[PDB]
Design a protein around this ligand. Sequence first.
Ligand code: CLA
Ligand SMILES: CC1=C[C@H](O)CC(C)(C)[C@H]1/C=C/C(C)=C/C=C/C(C)=C/C=C/C=C(C)/C=C/C=C(C)/C=C/C1=C(C)C[C@H](O)CC1(C)C
Ligand SMILES: CC(=O)/C=C/C=C(C)/C=C/[C@H]1[C@H](C)CCCC1(C)C
Ligand SMILES: NCC(=O)NCC(=O)O
Lengths: 41, 165, 219, 207, 192
Amino acid sequence: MKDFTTYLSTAPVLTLLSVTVVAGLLIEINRFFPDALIAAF
Amino acid sequence: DVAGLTPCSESKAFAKRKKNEVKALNKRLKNYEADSAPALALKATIARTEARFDKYAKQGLLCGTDGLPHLIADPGLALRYGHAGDVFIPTIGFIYFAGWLGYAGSKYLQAVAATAKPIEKEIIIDVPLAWKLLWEGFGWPLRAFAEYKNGSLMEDDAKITVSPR
Amino acid sequence: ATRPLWQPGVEAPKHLDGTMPGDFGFDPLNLGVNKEALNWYRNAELQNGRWAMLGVAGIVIPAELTRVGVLNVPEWAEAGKVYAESENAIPFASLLMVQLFLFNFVEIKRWEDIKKPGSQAEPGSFLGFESGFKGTGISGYPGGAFNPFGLGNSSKEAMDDLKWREIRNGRLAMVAFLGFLSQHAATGKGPLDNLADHLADPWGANFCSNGVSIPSALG
Amino acid sequence: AGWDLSAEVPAHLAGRKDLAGNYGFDPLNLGKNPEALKWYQQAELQNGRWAMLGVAGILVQELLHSTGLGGKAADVYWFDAGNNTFWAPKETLIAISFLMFNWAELNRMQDYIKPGSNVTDPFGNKIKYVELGYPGFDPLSFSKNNFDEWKLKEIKNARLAMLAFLGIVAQHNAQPGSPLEQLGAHLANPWKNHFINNGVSPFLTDN
Amino acid sequence: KAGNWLPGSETPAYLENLPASYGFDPLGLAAEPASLARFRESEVFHGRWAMLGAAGVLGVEVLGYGNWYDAPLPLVQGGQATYFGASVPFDLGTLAAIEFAAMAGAESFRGAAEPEKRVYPGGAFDPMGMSKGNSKELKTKEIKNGRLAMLACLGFAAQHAATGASPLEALASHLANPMAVNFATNGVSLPL
Ligand code: CLA
Ligand SMILES: CC1=C[C@H](O)CC(C)(C)[C@H]1/C=C/C(C)=C/C=C/C(C)=C/C=C/C=C(C)/C=C/C=C(C)/C=C/C1=C(C)C[C@H](O)CC1(C)C
Ligand SMILES: CC(=O)/C=C/C=C(C)/C=C/[C@H]1[C@H](C)CCCC1(C)C
Ligand SMILES: NCC(=O)NCC(=O)O
């Protein structure tokens, strides 16, 4: 376990995981708030 | 109007573009039973297009000679014309988020530099420490201005290595 | 040191000792690790808290007094336009410039306090009034001409107690003013209007029903 | 312990016996700070004396209103007293009261800040002074025998009167009429006329 | 001292030997010697100006020449200012000029002197020689009358800015109906 979590902290896996999380977040934001051209508040 | 650009809610070419794009999607519709999955997809697409064109007209974006929204990139000439959401507000938003990520990374570097194996803590990140610093990075304007007024943000060039001229 | 903290069980950071009034060990973002920045933030909190206490008073007290039937002043959001449309009203630009010109003098004086907390007491500054600016050793607590009644001007720990009362009330006032701003942006009603509305139907009239708090897109 | 058997006097009320009506009642420890307790004793005395005056006024004036003796002045409800004309309008009465009470209450406050420094009048008359909250106003000198007993009587009646005034205002907001009118209303049945059956107090019953 | 402002109290130590001192300094404005040494002269001058002002406000109205407020109205309105009934044919600009020249030379001569000579100049400013013969009591007289006149001038300005009447007119309106013609009755001063 400790070594498995160390493996999950490696740059190859953590980078890929973070890119996946940020990509998913942008995809969700664009799915619910689409076609937003300006910061209309 | 800020420079010969009538509001898209007034421009006839903008509404004409709306019309033409919707008419294209209608022509694509006229081939499926209006209850099949392709028909539902086309109807959803048309609803999305109509919503976008109404949203753009509501927010008062400027359309040119053609029917396409234009943006203003000068504070003052966009703040006295109600167009600060075009470049200035997203400028603030970006600058903030970019600074947040940069400050989180910078502080992580300065935190793992003073350890046993600093070259090891870059390829095997310490996730709890990275996450703590990622949370602390949200106040980056405050902390960065504090470090500049303190002089601890930067390093004097007498200590940075340089090339032999 | 052993004082109650914002989270019981979470120890306070080793920079928020226990000397500042209002110190509960709350600093998750670690904004006050630098001592000089911590002093500037303390002074900023004092200014924000005092202005928010004044503002929230001038918002609720006229509002509640209007509600019962006295003074019948407008609601705080439209009070700017209500005066602005009056006959002999000062123009907005000139009014704002008058206010900013006065506050320039006052706030640069307070600033030169914040740097060296005895700066403005040098003789020859004002016309004999410079003595009242000597400060009290801590920035943000002038005393002298300020504090005319000499409250807490006795037992030191008495002044420490009133400092905690002041800072707690100021924190409450700033939270309440953020509440007023966010409530008027969402529900175009007044503070007491929202209060008397929520008590009517707490499960129906809240922040998950105005439709502005929770995004309509999601639901 | 006195106020509630098997409980325990809260230390700061334990050995501090020179307070009138000390029964150890302090579930909230507002008086833990000695200066706070020194201020709170004075607050209790002021509230109690003013409430004895006010409740005596309410009860006597409303008894006169019910029976009928004081004329058009007193044939009104206590809370509707602003409709009587009087020798002055409301405003000048309020202004006069501001001025006079500023004088009296600042004399008392100056007594508080340095006890005993303000006893003498501009004409040189000098009164005595015993204890902080008790300025020794004794024209008939009911204070030389069993003084603690007399202070106990005063404080107990003061607490009763403050309770009475809280009841007066709560009942006036709950049920209509004069206080003694409500007392008679309760005494009428009484098993139905009680705070439960008002539609204003439980709220759990009949909306 | 002679006075205690607050009958029981402790008064500022530096206020003891001054003429007409009541220990009135709860703000500590004159704690340092220079501030007090300036404020004494400022107060005396303020009192003299007030006494003269109040005399003028009473005299311009008690004799029968109008208010203390309408004084400068005949300065514009085309022209023509009245003084006892003369025309004094002097437009607005020359009044400011003549008064500026006079007050500039006078105030630049009275101040350029020593601190005692700045406030209590014997010279020709005591023609009847009342400056000697125990002047401490007379200094108390001057200072207390000056305080009274300062409050009088402040009251003139405030009651005009509230009721719009005149000192004698306000006094008459109060004496006729003391009961509903007070500061408490005009809805400016007392609001509640
Ligand atoms: C947190 C790390 C970090 C920080 C604070 C900076 C900061 C800076 N960089 Mg730099 N850079 C980085 C990483 C970083 N860089 C990496 C990984 C690369 C390799 C691709 C580069 C390559 C690079 C070049 C070629 C240049 C700079 C330049 C600069 C300066 C101009 C600002 C800018 O827009 O740069 C631009 C930023 C990039 C081009 C890429 C950014 C990389 C990602 C987005 C950030 C990394 C975050 C980290 C992985 C996450 C850690 C978080 C933690 C919780 C674990 C600035 C001081 C410019 C300069 O010379 O100064 C004037 C310049 O030309 N950088
Ligand atoms: C502590 C910490 C630390 C950690 O580490 C991190 C974190 C978490 C970030 C933190 C937190 C923070 C916070 C919470 C903040 C908030 C603040 C506020 C709210 C302020 C306000 C503040 C506020 C303020 C000043 C206000 C003021 C006000 C005013 C003047 C008003 C005025 C007025 C009036 C009267 C009336 C009229 O008609 C109108 C007007 C004109 C409008
Ligand atoms: C605003 C303006 O225009 C200048 C006013 C000058 C003054 C008050 C100077 C006054 C004196 C001082 C204090 C010492 C030297 C000369 C004075 C006349 C006694
Ligand atoms: N050296 C000039 C001086 O002392 N002036 C005092 C004043 O301003 O009255």
